[PDB]
A paper describes a structure:
We observed a ligated heterodimer of [name] with a stoichiometry of two receptor ectodomains to one [name] ligand (2:1 complex) at a lower resolution (4.2–8.4 Å). The three [name] molecules observed are referred to as chain A (teal), chain B (dark blue) and chain C (powder blue) in superimposable conformations in all three structures (RMSD below 2 Å). The [name] homodimer is composed of chain D (for distal, in yellow) and chain P (for proximal, in orange), attached to [name] chain A at the concave side and to chain B at its “back” or convex side. Nonetheless, [name] adopts an asymmetric binding mode, reminiscent of that found in Drosophila despite the lack of sequence conservation, in which chain P contributes about 610 Å2 and chain D, 280 Å2 to the concave binding site. The interactions of [name] chain P at the concave site involves mostly residues from the first and third β-strand of [name] (Gln-14 and Leu-16, and Tyr-71, respectively) with the LRRNT1 of [name] (Tyr-79A, Tyr-65A and His-54A, respectively). Chain D of [name] binds extensively to the dimerization interface with over 1,300 Å2 of its accessible surface area, while chain P contributes only 180 Å2, confined to a loop that protrudes from the convex side of LRR14. By contrast in our cryo-EM structure, the β-wings adopt a very different conformation contacting the Z-loop in a pincer-like grasp. Loop structures of Spaetzle1C and [name] intercalate, temporarily bridging the receptor C-termini to promote signalling. The dimerization interface of 1480 Å2 is one and a half times the area of the concave binding surface, suggesting a higher affinity binding compared to the concave interface, while the absence of particles with a stoichiometry of 1:1 may indicate a sequential mechanism of assembly in nonequilibrium unsaturated complexes. As there is no possible contact at the dimer interface for the second ligand, we propose that the asymmetric disposition of the receptor chains is the molecular basis of negative cooperativity in the system, where binding of the first ligand in non-saturating conditions makes binding of a second molecule energetically unfavourable.
Residue numbers in the entry:
A (entry chain A): 31 to 784
B (entry chain P): 6 to 97
C (entry chain B): 32 to 783
D (entry chain D): 6 to 104
């Protein structure tokens, strides 16, 4: 049962290391050269990474009868049994053996394996020199045999000694060409693969015992031509796989006898631009096939016949030009087709409708420009279409009639104008929905319309299809957000990247659906945040909860002058002034910026045209949408003010750059509170100011500047009273008595006037 | 070997190799096989051996890795007996 | 067809609104009987009146269709079924069903005239006193069912019909058996006798059953058997035994049959012992279950000669010890389960005999420990169930030979496991704890919700990249650090109710992209503030991260001020703690020296004496932040020390005290908060106006409880407080000694 | 130049529990840095199976490395031994098709 090393202490070298994993062992202790690993009676993996680790001095190890033995480049005796060489190992009945040498190629004969015959999976690699049918003759019930990377040539009669063997495979064997009968004696060869062997060409004589063959794989075998019946010599083959081979053409009808073929693969068949007609005809059955990446120029009218229907039949990257309608005729059904990267301006539609059942189809990367209606009307079964990277600008009104239950579409890098009126022909016939084929599309899982001339957004689609969760839009011609678009009651994800969006119209879309996570991306959209964005500005301003999610950092408002390249973080919503600013009555030297949040219009003038600036048209309440007002006269000398306060609808005054020379409380507005009143000159005061002074409207803040003041008895006590209410005074010292200049508290008035 | 390049797997007990320029810490009192690492070595002339089944510009290359320590062995000056800057797998 | 019969003078009809079906209200002359008819489904009718009077019914024959009447609608005795067929004549439908509820009839052959050819037959609550006559005309019969009934059977009754494919006798409460009752039936391979009271199995009672394949004993109070019962039935395929109070089988009971595929022995508590070599060389045997059987101990020689077993199930059985010679004969086995069994020590040299075993369940056994040699030759495990098995430890090389594992359900553990250090000697290596888990590369699911886990092992986030789900609730993990979290996978974690006292999270949370990690922390005695502020803000006001924390049922424990407080409502501004052991504070007061959110804090409000030095021991603010606060309030200091060299502080407090003057040297200019409230200020502090300075920190002087002398000298104090009233935290409390009123209300004319 | 089976290498911080330094003082001072340990795994597209631009192999697998960290048995009580693993490197390995 258990295995242990006999004398681990016999030599300082050859130290034993036993674990439940494997009785690990190696002769050199600190720097092992030979290595041995046996786990339990099943696999003995060992190696001799250097010649001096001679097995001659190796101690005998009571190896049990394991079923697998592996030898890795260990030194091998000369014309002697492997077991005899490894007398120090006692594996009685091994079932599978492996060998791989980085050096020491050896001629192979029977005497090497005269003790090793009860074996099933023999495999040599990197060191095969010659077979000569000597070794393989003395074997029985072999299961698998393999050679690898040996650069060898064989006599035809070598393998014929053993008639039956389940599998054989040769890779990197470096055979110049198959001998006519190299594997002649094959009876049980279920599958053979020659992947890497630059075979010169193929001859039918090399193919014998073909009945056992079921699979055959070729990878890089640099052949150019084939015999007229080398593959027609058999039918028992089930799977065939040829790739990466430099053959320019094929004989016609090379598989007519091979009617029992299930799967064929022919990919990256370079130098292959054309195929023989009828070659795949009479193929009474076939599971799958792909011919992609071969660059085939043109095809016969119907290459395939006899098969009830195949699954893949893909020809992507074969840059096809003309597609005859006569194919698919033998195939009433087919699951999936791909013809991408093919020079196709338009498929002849009736070829497509020849089949009815269909899964996903791909026609992208083609030069597709026109799309006929009669290509999908009977296409009842259909999945997503991959048609992007095509010169597409128009589509039929309703082309999904066959499959209204389509899930996804990816129209990218096309030029679909898709304007609102582009579809809608009879304007009064359809009102809510244009005649987009979205009405046919009752559902659309994912849509990819980025990089297309998307002139118009269609909210009807939300009603045309009700199963929509991820919308892909970029490089689109939408001028701005559309009203009432969030109304889908599903977790739509949307992208607005590199799209000419200037204004957000979503206040009409302001409606939250329960358990909905709407998503939009805001990238390279030339927003003009000047007007009609304040509600949206605050909505995105710390959006605590919203069904819609945004990508704002990817955006930066630029269209407003001050708000140039201004992302939200830079942006302050309180400075959003509507762009129009045109009451059509404000002075030319002046400007009127209505504030949406304040319900006021910033009455800011310019130019200092004249000191006596007449009162602004305050009664114009901007169509009564802004009753409260604010007068912010900028850069103007001022002497003319509203007498009797004919305009009480203002609480803000500026008096910037004013050259003031007068004062009158009746001239002073009452409801006006926040008055800068810069550049002052008053050295006196009228006591009626306090009678007018009443901050009920707002904080009556005043900032007297550049002011020459004469401090005398009536005004001094008045300033004392006002300092008692100095909460509305910018600075007490702003008085700064023009003759002297001092503090109101310091001065006493009895001495001044007694 | 279903892998890309032939390789050598060894379990040497190294004697002198350091991330810094000083392996003297490990040149004294390592005679009881204190440590052993399954060092993998690529096939000789790895650069001259691009991967089979491929012809990429990137042929087989052998990288490195480290293993520091704090463990107290049976010697005085052993800040870390675990070996550092050790060769690693070979791949294209 | 005639799904809606016509209405006419002789007998009208009314087709109810159903396509291809119809509620046959066709008579409609009185709501006496209501009929429901489909194209072929049923013709059964709500015969309200027990006397149907089919003659007084439209008698609408439509020929032999599979629809029938079974409910409540009967006929008088001694009458051919054709008389019952009066409403609808059929031509020997192969489907006949009837369920007699009101009574039970002899079901005579004379009674059965009109339906002879049949395939599906049903009888219910009757069949009493029936001769070997009705079976004569029922040729090509395949199915027969008996509902709840009661009648002893005459032997060889159904000899005429050997063609019956299926038989149903359940609920009959079959009393006894006779070797020869069924010998006239050979095509009978389906048979069930549940809800019966067969006392003993008569020797060869099942003889004369040439092709019997299915046998169902489900509710069968049986205690006695015989090998002769199953001797002749070598063609039997699968057998079921359930609810039989036998104690043991006779020897040689089952070796007679050969193509025995499946055996079920469920729920025989009386069954305590088994004969040796019960399953003697039956390669056909694939699935055998003995669950919930009070079997005492398993005899060694039971399954020799049979290797085709795929499922071996023992269930909740009283078995105690296992001889090693139970996997010997079965190189191939898929599932093994030994659940809720008094087994306490699995023999080590057991599992080597199989390689392809995939699962194992030893739930609630008494497995004191496990040997390493158990898992030598097993490369197919995906599950493992050792829930509450009295384990104590894990051998280090336990999973050496089991790499194919995917999931472990160690689960509830009525036991202990020292999960602290497998190897921690002076020779130990800090690379990774040498736990047996390092081998389990593809491991994904692991549960220990009950074990005495000392702490977490590193290798789980290192040597197990497939980890997906893990629980450690009700375990003994003291603390947690970020270095124990680098799992790089969407892993949910349950550590609630563990003794987590503190956690340490770096502020710079580094996560793999899209690493959704969810951890459950509730009912854990969590100390707060200390090294937790980064964690606190990580969880409190958590905006968005790949880390999620089920912390609803968690509460602060250690801070007495924040006792049992919810964390979410708590904030770092409330958090402070002291574990540097420095003697900086004078100890004459509360004398804080803690780090209140990256800010040294001192609170000497603990009854500070008058003129007590403000900072007798100022903090060097080493390895910390110079932001310092002093709290000396509620303390009677009618005069503060008002003398202190510049010290790195930003906050001062002095209430329930008083002041007479101030020194510029005493006041550093890096001050933000100065209380000077609730303290009398009678005199005019003239020097303060000189020391009034634009300090660096945000000055917030709450000068209050002041009763100055409103007069001309230093009257500019009003200008000082009014020029920057925002700095002045309060002006109303300034209420001069002569006239107590807010100074703002007093003008210069009042002053002078 | 890019290689087959791009893989992500990581410096995992060593055990920073430090025997629960919060056992007696709860003020952290573990702000320093140590060399850590370098581990590389191939989670490119969560181990994107086609490992190379060259393709020809749609499967690459991470590989551990076991190290016999002890044979000294310096405890003077038993031949203490131990094997430690870690996913040292990842590499591409071709498969064998059914055909
Ligand atoms: C010698 O070659 C033969 C093939 O000619 C090997 O038999 C095959 O061995 C492999 C693995 O050893 C088996 O693969 C497994 O098959 C089961 C079947 O269900 C599957 O579930 C597993 O996932 C796995 O793919 C394969 O089945 C088996 N062939 C047959 C027909 O069963 C044989 O193993 C080789 N010798 C040695 C020593 O390995
Ligand atoms: C090729 O033949 C079979 C597989 O196709 C492998 O098994 C061999 O089968 C032949 C029968 O054609 C056996 O010859 C005779 O078999 C009977 C019954 O086994 C035996 O009683 C006779 O004495 C005689 O041997 C042969 O023994 C059998 N050998 C083994 C190892 O199974 C055969 O190995 C394949 N290869 C060769 C070189 O025959
Ligand atoms: C209302 O209209 C007045 C026009 O009188 C606008 O005044 C203008 O404001 C801009 C602000 O960017 C001034 O430009 C900047 O002025 C500052 C002043 O120091 C200077 O440092 C900058 O380099 C830049 O030139 C502009 O000079 C000024 N012009 C006048 C004639 O006043 C005012 O901005 C308008 N109010 C708004 C837009 O809200
Ligand atoms: C007597 O009762 C038996 C009960 O098994 C009937 O046998 C089976 O009856 C079903 C429908 O009654 C036949 O159709 C089957 O339906 C299932 C479910 O849709 C479908 O999965 C099958 O593929 C098949 O279509 C079935 O063929 C039949 N035989 C079987 C299951 O072996 C029998 O038809 C009844 N006979 C009379 C005269 O009432
Ligand atoms: C773990 O939980 C995370 C959630 O944080 C899941 O996130 C998913 O992560 C994958 C890649 O790690 C994402 O796939 C890629 O996403 C980007 C952006 O979304 C997209 O541009 C790529 O084309 C690709 O689809 C996936 O979207 C993301 N799903 C989310 C965020 O909902 C992740 O699936 C979970 N599992 C693992 C193994 O990480
Ligand atoms: C059991 O079934 C067999 C056929 O499977 C029946 O035998 C048939 O009986 C009819 C009766 O007239 C003959 O016409 C057929 O020629 C017979 N065929 C065979 C193959 O024997 C047999 O009668 C059935 N036994 C019953 C119903 O008890
Ligand atoms: C959690 O573990 C504890 C102990 O580890 C279990 O409590 C008791 O454990 C002893 C161990 O000998 C048993 O004898 C008792 O029967 C257990 N008591 C109970 C009430 O079960 C406890 O059961 C475990 N809980 C879970 C859910 O596994
Ligand atoms: C979009 O499609 C056009 C079509 O030629 C292509 O040139 C362009 O690269 C694609 N992508 C973008 C971002 O425009
Ligand atoms: C959409 O997201 C919300 C949360 O924003 C969620 O409650 C809801 O379940 C999601 N929709 C669906 C269909 O799951
Ligand atoms: C108004 O005129 C004064 C006088 O020179 C000047 O100082 C001031 O800047 C002017 N204001 C503006 C807004 O130009």
């Amino acid at each position: 049962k258990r295995f242990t090393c006999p004398e681990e202490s016999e030599a300082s070298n050859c130290s034993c290391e036993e674990f439940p994993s494997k009785t690990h062992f190696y002769c050199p202790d600190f720097n092992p050269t030979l290595y041995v690993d046996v786990e339990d009676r099943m696999r003995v993996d060992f190696k001799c990474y250097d010649e001096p680790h001679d097995f001659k001095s190796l101690p005998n190890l009571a190896i049990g009868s394991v079923k697998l033995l592996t030898v890795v480049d260990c030194v091998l005796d000369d014309d002697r049994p492997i077991l005899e060489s490894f007398k120090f190992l006692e594996v009685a009945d091994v079932r599978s053996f492996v060998y791989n040498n980085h050096e020491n190629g050896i001629r192979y004969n029977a005497k090497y394996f005269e003790g090793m015959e009860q074996l099933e999976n023999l495999t040599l690699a990197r060191g095969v020199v010659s077979i000569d049918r000597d070794t393989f003759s003395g074997f029985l019930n072999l299961k698998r045999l393999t050679i690898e990377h040996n650069k060898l040539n064989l006599q035809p009669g070598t393998f014929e000694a053993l008639s039956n063997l389940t599998y054989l495979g040769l890779v990197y064997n470096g055979l110049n060409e198959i001998q006519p009968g190299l594997f002649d004696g094959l009876e049980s060869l279920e599958a053979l693969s020659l992947s890497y062997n630059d075979i010169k060409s193929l001859s039918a004589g090399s193919f014998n015992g073909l009945s056992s063959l079921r699979m055959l794989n070729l990878r890089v075998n640099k052949i150019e031509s084939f015999d007229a019946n080398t593959f027609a010599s058999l039918k028992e083959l089930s799977r065939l796989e040829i790739t990466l081979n430099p053959f320019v053409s094929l004989p016609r009808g090379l598989f007519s006898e091979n009617k029992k073929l299930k799967t064929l693969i022919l990919t990256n068949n370079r130098k292959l631009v054309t195929l023989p007609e009828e070659l795949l005809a009479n193929l009474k059955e076939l599971t799958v096939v792909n011919l992609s990446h071969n660059g085939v120029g043109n095809l016969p009218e119907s290459l395939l016949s006899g098969s009830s229907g195949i699954i893949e039949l893909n020809l992507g990257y074969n840059r096809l030009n003309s597609l005859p309608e006569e194919l698919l005729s033998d195939q009433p059904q087919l699951q999936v087709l791909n013809l991408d990267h093919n020079q196709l301006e338009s498929i002849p539609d009736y070829f497509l409708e020849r089949n009815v059942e269909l899964q996903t189809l791909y026609l992208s990367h083609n030069r597709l420009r026109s799309l006929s209606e009669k290509a999908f009307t009977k296409l009842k079964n259909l999945k997503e279409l991959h048609l992007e990277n095509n010169q597409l600008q128009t589509i039929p009104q309703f082309l999904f009639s066959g499959t209204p239950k389509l899930e996804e579409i990816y129209m990218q890098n096309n030029q679909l104008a898709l304007h609102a009126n582009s579809f809608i022909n009879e304007e009064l016939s359809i009102a809510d929905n244009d005649n987009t084929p979205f009405q046919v599309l009752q559902k659309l899982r994912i849509l990819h319309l980025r990089n297309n001339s998307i002139s118009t957004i269609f909210q009807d689609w939300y009603i045309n299809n009700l199963e929509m969760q991820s919308l892909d839009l970029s490089f689109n011609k939408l001028p701005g957000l559309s009203y009432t678009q969030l109304q889908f009651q599903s977790n739509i994800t949307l992208n607005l990247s590199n799209n000419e969006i200037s204004q957000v119209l979503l206040i009409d879309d302001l409606d939250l659906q329960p358990y909905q996570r709407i998503n939009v991306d805001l990238n390279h959209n030339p927003l003009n945040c000047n007007c009609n964005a304040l509600k949206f500005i605050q909505l995105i301003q710390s959006k605590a909860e919203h069904g819609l999610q945004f990508n704002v950092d990817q955006l930066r408002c630029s269209e407003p002058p001050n708000l140039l390249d201004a992302t939200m973080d830079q942006l302050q919503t309180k400075d959003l002034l509507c762009d129009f600013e045109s009451a059509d009555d404000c002075p030319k030297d002046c400007q009127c910026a209505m504030r949406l949040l304040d319900h006021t219009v910033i009455v800011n003038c310019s130019g200092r045209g004249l000191t006596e600036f007449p009162d602004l048209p305050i009664p114009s309440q901007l169509h009564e949408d802004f009753n409260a007002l604010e007068v912010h006269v900028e850069n103007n000398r001022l002497t003319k003010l509203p007498n009797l306060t004919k305009h009480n609808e203002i609480t803000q005054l500026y008096a910037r750059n004013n050259s003031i020379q007068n004062l009158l409380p009746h001239n002073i507005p009452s409801k006006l509170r926040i008055i800068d009143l810069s550049q002052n000159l008053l050295k006196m005061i009228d006591d009626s100011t306090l009678a007018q002074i009443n901050r009920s409207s707002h904080l009556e803040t005043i900032r007297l500047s550049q002011n020459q003041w004469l401090c005398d008895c009536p005004a001094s006590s008045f300033l004392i009273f006002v300092q008692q209410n100095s909460r509305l005074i910018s600075d007490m010292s702003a008085i700064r008595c023009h003759p002297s200049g001092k503090s109101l508290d310091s001065i006493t008035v009895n001495e001044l006037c007694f | 070997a279903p892998f890309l390049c032939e390789s050598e797997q060894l379990l040497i007990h190294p004697k002198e190799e350091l991330s810094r320029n000083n392996s003297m810490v490990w040149i004294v009192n390592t005679k009881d096989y204190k440590q052993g690492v399954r060092i993998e070595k690529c096939l000789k002339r790895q650069l001259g051996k691009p991967c089979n089944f491929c012809d990429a510009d990137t042929e087989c290359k052998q990288l490195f890795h480290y293993r520091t320590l704090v463990a107290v062995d049976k010697v005085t000056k052993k800040p870390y007996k675990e070996q550092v800057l050790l060769p690693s797998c070979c791949k294209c």
